[PDB]
Design a binder for these strands. Sequence first.
DNA 1: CTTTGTCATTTTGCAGGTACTCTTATTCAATAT
RNA 2: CUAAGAGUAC
DNA 3: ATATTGTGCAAAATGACAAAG
Lengths: 56, 49, 214, 56, 287, 217, 116, 98
Amino acid sequence: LPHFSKDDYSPESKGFVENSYLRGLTPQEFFFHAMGGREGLIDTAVKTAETGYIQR
Amino acid sequence: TTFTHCEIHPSMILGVAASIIPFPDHNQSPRNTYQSAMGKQAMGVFLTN
Amino acid sequence: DQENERNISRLWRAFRTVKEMVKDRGYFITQEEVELPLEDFKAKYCDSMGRPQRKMMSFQANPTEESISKFPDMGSLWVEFCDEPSVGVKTMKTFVIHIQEKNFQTGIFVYQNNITPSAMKLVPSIPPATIETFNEAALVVNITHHELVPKHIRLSSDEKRELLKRYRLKESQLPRIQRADPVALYLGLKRGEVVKIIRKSETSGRYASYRICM
Amino acid sequence: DGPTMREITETIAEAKKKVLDVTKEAQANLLTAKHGMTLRESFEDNVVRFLNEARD
Amino acid sequence: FDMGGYFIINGSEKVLIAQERSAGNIVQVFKKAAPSPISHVAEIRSALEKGSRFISTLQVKLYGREGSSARTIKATLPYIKQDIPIVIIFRALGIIPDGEILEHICYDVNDWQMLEMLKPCVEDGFVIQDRETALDFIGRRGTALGIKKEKRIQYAKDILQKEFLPHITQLEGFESRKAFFLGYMINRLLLCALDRKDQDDRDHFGKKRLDLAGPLLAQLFKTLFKKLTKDIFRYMQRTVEEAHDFNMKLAINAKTITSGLKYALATGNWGERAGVSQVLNRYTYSS
Amino acid sequence: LEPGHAADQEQAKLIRSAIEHTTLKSVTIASEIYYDPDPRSTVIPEDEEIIQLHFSLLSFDQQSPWLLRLELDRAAMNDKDLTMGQVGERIKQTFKNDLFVIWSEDNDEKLIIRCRVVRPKSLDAETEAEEDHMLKKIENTMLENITLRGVENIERVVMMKYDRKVPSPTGEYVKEPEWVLETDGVNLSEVMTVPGIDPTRIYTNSFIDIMEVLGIE
Amino acid sequence: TTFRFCRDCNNMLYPREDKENNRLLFECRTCSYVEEAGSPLVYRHELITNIGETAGVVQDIGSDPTLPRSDRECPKCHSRENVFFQSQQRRKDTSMVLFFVCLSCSHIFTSDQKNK
Amino acid sequence: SLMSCISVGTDPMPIITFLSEWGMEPLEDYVPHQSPDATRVFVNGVWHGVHRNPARLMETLRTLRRKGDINPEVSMIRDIREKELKIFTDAGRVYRPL
DNA sequence: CTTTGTCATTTTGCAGGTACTCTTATTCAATAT
RNA sequence: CUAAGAGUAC
DNA sequence: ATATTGTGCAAAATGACAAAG
Ligand SMILES: [Zn+2]
Ligand SMILES: [Zn+2]
């Protein structure tokens, strides 16, 4: 993200969410979690199509 | 400490539908996506005329 | 000389696998010849200089009593090993005429690297004699000892007829096994012959299948 | 309760310290690559393992 | 509370969805798959806003895998049936000496790796040592196949002036600029092939553009008005050939523009893409 | 591995070296071509010792002045059981007498391989000009076309410690450890015959190879 | 490799064998310009390349606000402040060693240990 | 996003004139050997020339855009490592305020 | 001289299952009877 | 009626 | 005035082509 310096491999830089849902997420953690959820949804769609064809 | 800009507000990264969610940072992201999709199907008053 | 040592070791392993193959085919081979140690093989089939010799390595086998009772139509068998890396047409011709004049119905030719295609065309000789070619590199390891490979037993014509009668099957309704399958080549299967397969099954202890050579 | 939250924070901090130590070793090039993978792959594997066991 | 931003076509509220595309006039270098003989491809989707608005895709390709020895770079010029070697293009534009071409491509004397990777190209084009010769070589490859032997040069010139890198310029006397741009593209490709930079990310949002109502209606109306003016020219030619009188009212068919715009906005299909125009959602204000 | 040598870690290392495919590309740090007018004295000081051994131990009048020099890696020679003698012998075998090859000793600070193309006695008025190109081509193939050790299609081999169930002599089943080899790439026919391994228990993901090697069952 | 160009027609120069003196000689392929070879080396091929890791260093690299800062010792100024970044060679197997530029003297020093 | 906007595009001629006035060396008489450490200036993907003091040029361009002389939609990027300066004024670019 | 295996092209057929709503459009224009 | 397209539910 | 006509796998199949007798 443009909120981090270059070449930052620290856990918070590359998507570690140290806060719980009870505490709430910082904006960077919120975006990274959004990316993870997006990957999940995309995988769901692709998976259902492919598995339907394989099952047939 | 070498900043060149500052975010006006982080909550402005959300869109129109996601800006309705209360405490969106205390939710699992797919739930936010579901609510963003499902609020367009909410029943209200679309126009006063 | 490490190349020579590895070559002679591979040749010994190939010899052991060939003996096992011939014994499994139903011929009379004693278990002692099968388990011949490396030092004995080196003493016997290798010259003083250290180069193994193949001409005296070739041998003959004959059917056992049980095979004769079950298969009263198959006589003696000849196994030959070639010396030169590439087998010429003249050598194959000598082998086939030797097989024909000795009245061997089966002859296994074990070659080093390859066969000239002009020698392949004359491999099918006048029946009932059959010629089978094997590469030494493919015979270094006996595939049938793999735990994935179950037990293959060739059936007699009477057994095949009984099987087809009892299961009401036609020729095409049996599971197939290609006449190039490594186990089929190992057992010398021919088209129309059925092999009974005994398998370790995890639902019932033993399961018997059958495959017809196509 | 408060003591458990404090212990959780301490665990997260210790994991972040271990990640920082591994990062220092990698930056000093003192980290040796696990056989079958590159240096960066081994570093990423170690960091992910540490963070996962920290969350656990 | 109504915010506007939509059209009323036949009493229906129609909204134009912003169409995403890749930006033009940006050099993008991509690694190719192992089976293909080309390892890296540097391409630009050149376009000019104040012109015919036509898309010409130039590609610079590096033949040969990493282990291969004959690594020659070839460019794919428009209206040409073969991938011309880059040095032939450079000599055609007017840069004869090998040193000048290499200077146009590589900007550092110490970067001997790039020079080593670039030697095969000049060895390939060693057989041509003249601008006219290179122009003839390109013209021979010309797919038009309607040019005499002497005018091939001019044909090649035309292709290099009005089809090669249109976004730079359509005029003449800017051969140096186009040669510099080609050297820049080759430099980018070689940087990607020398593992000095990663292949360009196709998903980087700064490399994308959104065509809104403005540009969509712009290109639609450009096509439709070109149709109308072609009709005007055809009518004028017909009436002058037949000696009939000329009338503007019978010349212009306003139904052309009107019906074209109304059809494009009433149904999503944007032409003569789909779903470009959609019925505005009025279930809820946030919707 | 062979049941008697299942736990022998160094035997597993030996097998791993035996089957893993290795090429000069994974060993050579760099390659160069020099102009040495005589194949008796070198214009490079660093490798002078090499020649003043080999030529002293040792024909040379029909050798091209162009020399191909390969600089190898100490770490490459360490993580893989390779030595200068082995690689020199492999190059010599694969290129016959057409290429005179010398190499530095392993204990030397730098690993250097020097090669020269033997000139045929027939005169060549144009091949001399392209000799460099020819050497380049040779160097190219020497980088990838020859194999030092291992069998083809085996990109990388890793060693793992599995724990199987073995019936103990007293009667129970015990958790016996075992050294097992995982391999990227499949060359089942060539791997299965390698001595020291258990030919019976070899297994592969690619059931196509299993079918074409072992049988339909 | 340090290639050189002809000074007559600005074309490439290629190596050539000599018979009278048995020496390497660089020649032009179109105008026949001839000169001596500075070094016997005529071809270099880097399987493992070390250059390009510090590429892009400029006198104003410190003006970049995206680059991270550090207080590590400069072994020419003993100054604290400097900028740092990882290796620029984008090969997937490169090491994670860091490079540092002092904003006062512009000396590039690494965080490696075996090299030191 | 709530504060995201799409540029509508502007004529790049004034910016080209600014660049020419402020020291942008024309591409026609550019010889890389005599100017090795020169920043390449791009406008809408068209390499227009090189500059020898990119820091001052970026400073004055930022000042001009901040006072309204340059249209605010114009985007100006300076890649120090690649020694490049890109300016984009075309339409369709999505931007946000900061 | 003809194989012979071998790569590099060409085809070429496919791409989950139900279900709901709405919107537009059905060849344009010139000629001859 | 037919066709095409768009949006949507699980 | 109106009817009539000017897409990305990935397997299979196929063709071109340096080596072999
Ligand atoms: Zn010259
Ligand atoms: Zn300093």
